[PDB]
Design a protein around this ligand. Structure first.
Ligand SMILES: *[C@@H]1O[C@H](CO)[C@@H](O[C@@H]2O[C@H](CO)[C@@H](O)[C@H](O)[C@H]2NC(C)=O)[C@H](O)[C@H]1NC(C)=O
Ligand code: NAG
Ligand code: NAG
Ligand code: NAG
Ligand code: NAG
Ligand code: NAG
Lengths: 50, 300, 29, 238
């Protein structure tokens, strides 16, 4: 439940929903917001696995 | 080697894209706001609400070439795909040298006392050179600036109550050292340079958040298809899934539903007011059972 | 006489502690 | 004539238009605190059943309002910063056929056998008008008036009054109307011709959703160590 719950977090991004980031921004900005979400979600998976 | 291995994943792909927008054929009054007879003084900007319309922004490019068109929370070329909850147009005229202050986080004479944008700003700042309409050889009354204020302004806080400067150390009524007329006027001629000529500025503030929306861009609706894996866009909410009849009893107020993990699991159709459940399309891992390549190349 | 052929105690043990789960099925299976 | 502040554990409303079921949802918003001091105004409060000078009370963050009178004496609210013709003010009235919401630089006229008065005659520089079905018309008639980011959000619930004027049963208010008034509010006044006025504060609540999208209970996480325990564990049973 914690691992799934972490998907709703923004981790500094403008939005927690990846489709909204791609829908609203051009690639150059989307990459920054996406990298913020990737870092947070990847860290959450490593925490879960550990 | 002989055994079962996990290789890739499978997903059921969508077969069509369904977009649903409300029964609105009214165009947004962007031409009335941009093609104004007169623009409000920056100290007293004119806030026009845009609602119940299609935010077709092609008319903005038809209106004029632009000096500046900078979007902070959105792409300027994706505005016609998006659907906004609350859109406000702040219209005013300023000196060209102050255009760089119409941005989040800025300071200066305008950002501090006439018009300030929030740090958390989603929207677009649009500006154009209006010298041929606003400058006059005898001067004009379009330019007014609140040079002195007891405190700095908060974002979108309008304050048009003018008394007298408190610049000095004594109360007074117009005394020149301690008191100045509270709101200054400036005269401009068409012969002034680029940094002094007037520019017309429209700021589009977009609350691009949550279920309600009265203004959607110029998308064309398609028919609904149920019990199939499709892509969808409901008033700007996008995703992939299977849309089925919902048995949840939504109140007239409620529009979207969510699961225990804050994911979307239901929407209201903008024209039918039917509640549709969203089921994710089937997915899962794929495992390959191999006898071993030194025995047989058959796999399951 | 019971399906699964468990003893009375095993059936009790199975009843006290609590195959597609829709909840959490966001890539986690 | 202000009376005892009583013990209200009411004023919970659906924080947004999101359907939830069998969910204990922890949210932070402006709510009337549980066991809060709600001023009870005492027909007409200080003036009395037949007098002028009804009180003007602060509007601090937002206001919880309720009226249990079947007299139908209360028909509206006036909100603004000065409540004077010079400063933009919002007028909400009920004529029992429609609800009329208008915001203009309305003048004060000591606004009230309960005849209609020529109040707010100088309705100059009008900014917004809205007309809908009546808000008000033995009924609790509970309302919440919140004013955030230019939106004057009005929530309400009308339930029967049978055994108690303020029964212990829980009932959440649903939004009735959301208006883009764009008005700055510091003070407000009731309009007459059992009025409970409380104030909202930033608080975190654990809200219990039913099988359907109905809120049936709530825990005020700052009220008691037990409430913090209930909120921390996301449960109403500890
Ligand atoms: C939730 O709403 C339903 C109505 O949509 C309520 O009514 C019951 O619904 C069930 C559905 O299977 C019926 O079998 C019952 O006969 C209905 N009862 C009545 C009195 O009409 C249901 O009670 C609501 N749930 C809760 C927990 O309040
Ligand atoms: C826009 O302004 C110009 C000014 O010359 C005017 O001619 C034109 O008719 C206006 N158009 C609209 C749609 O208001
Ligand atoms: C201000 O906006 C209102 C509403 O759109 C409009 O009627 C009025 O003419 C505008 N005035 C100026 C000076 O732009
Ligand atoms: C939109 O138009 C269709 C026309 O058939 C109508 O059935 C539907 O109810 C309308 N919806 C709204 C929300 O106005
Ligand atoms: C406290 O709540 C009870 C609930 O029955 C009520 O009767 C009582 O009057 C309330 N307290 C005060 C001070 O009024
Ligand atoms: C509330 O009233 C005071 C009266 O001094 C005023 O200064 C303040 O600005 C008002 N509130 C708002 C939100 O403007």
């Amino acid at each position: 439940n914690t691992l799934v719950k972490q998907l709703s977090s923004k981790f500094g991004a403008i939005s927690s929903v990846l489709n909204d980031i791609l829908s609203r921004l051009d690639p150059p900005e989307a990459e920054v917001q996406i990298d913020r979400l990737i870092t947070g979600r990847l860290q959450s998976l490593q925490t879960y696995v550990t | 080697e002989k055994g079962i291995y996990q290789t890739s994943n499978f997903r059921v792909q969508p077969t069509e894209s369904i977009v649903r927008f409300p029964n609105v054929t009214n165009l947004c009054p962007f031409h009335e706001v941009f093609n104004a007879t007169r623009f409000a003084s920056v100290y007293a900007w004119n806030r026009t609400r845009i609602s119940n319309c299609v935010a077709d922004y092609s008319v903005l490019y038809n209106f004029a070439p632009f000096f500046a068109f900078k979007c902070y929370g959105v792409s300027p070329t994706k505005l016609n795909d998006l659907c906004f909850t609350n859109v406000y147009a702040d219209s005013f005229v300023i000196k060209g040298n102050e255009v760089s202050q119409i941005a989040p986080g800025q300071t200066g004479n305008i950002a501090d006392y006439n018009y300030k944008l929030p740090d958390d700003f989603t929207g677009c700042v649009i500006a154009w050179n209006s010298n041929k309409l606003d400058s006059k050889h005898s001067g004009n009354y379009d330019y007014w600036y609140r040079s002195f204020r007891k405190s700095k302004l908060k974002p979108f806080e309008r304050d048009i109550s003018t008394e007298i400067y408190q610049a000095g150390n004594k109360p007074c009524k117009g005394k020149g050292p301690n008191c100045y007329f509270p709101l200054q006027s400036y005269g401009f001629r068409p012969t002034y340079g680029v940094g002094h000529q007037p520019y017309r500025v429209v700021v589009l503030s977009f609350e691009l958040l949550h279920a309600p929306a009265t203004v959607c861009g110029p998308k064309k609706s398609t028919n609904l298809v149920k019990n199939k894996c499709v892509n969808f866009n409901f008033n700007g909410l996008t995703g992939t899934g299977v849309l089925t009849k919902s048995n949840k009893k939504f109140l007239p107020f409620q529009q979207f539903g969510r699961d225990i993990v804050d994911t979307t699991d239901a929407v209201r159709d903008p024209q039918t007011l039917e509640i549709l459940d969203i089921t994710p399309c089937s997915f899962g891992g794929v495992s390959v059972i191999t006898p071993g390549t030194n025995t047989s190349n058959q796999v399951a | 006489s019971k399906p699964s052929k468990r003893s009375p105690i095993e059936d009790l043990l199975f009843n006290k502690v609590t195959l597609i789960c829709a909840q959490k099925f966001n890539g986690l299976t | 004539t202000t009376q005892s502040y009583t013990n209200f554990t009411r004023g919970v409303y659906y924080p947004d238009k999101v359907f939830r079921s069998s969910v204990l949802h922890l949210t932070q918003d402006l709510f009337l605190p549980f066991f809060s001091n709600v001023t009870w105004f005492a027909i007409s409060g200080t003036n009395g059943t037949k007098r002028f000078d009804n009180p003007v009370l602060p509007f601090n963050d937002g206001v919880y309002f309720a009226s249990t009178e079947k007299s139908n004496i209360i028909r509206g609210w006036i909100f603004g910063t000065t409540l004077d013709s010079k400063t933009q003010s919002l007028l909400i009235v009920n004529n029992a056929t429609n609800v009329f919401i208008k915001v203009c630089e309305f003048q004060f006229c000591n606004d009230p056998m309960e005849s209609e008065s020529g109040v707010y005659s100088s309705a100059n520089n009008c900014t917004f008008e809205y007309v809908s079905q009546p808000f008000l018309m033995k009924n609790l008639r509970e309302f919440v008036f919140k004013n955030i980011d230019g939106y004057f959000k009005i929530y309400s619930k009308h339930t029967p009054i049978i055994g108690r004027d303020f029964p212990q049963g829980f009932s959440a208010l649903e939004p009735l109307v959301d208006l883009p008034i764009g008005i700055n509010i510091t003070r407000f006044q009731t309009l007459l011709a059992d009025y409970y006025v409380g104030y909202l504060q930033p608080r975190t609540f654990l809200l219990k959703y039913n099988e359907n999208g109905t809120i049936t209970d709530a825990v005020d996480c700052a009220l008691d160590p037990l409430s913090e325990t209930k909120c921390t564990l996301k449960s109403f049973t500890v």
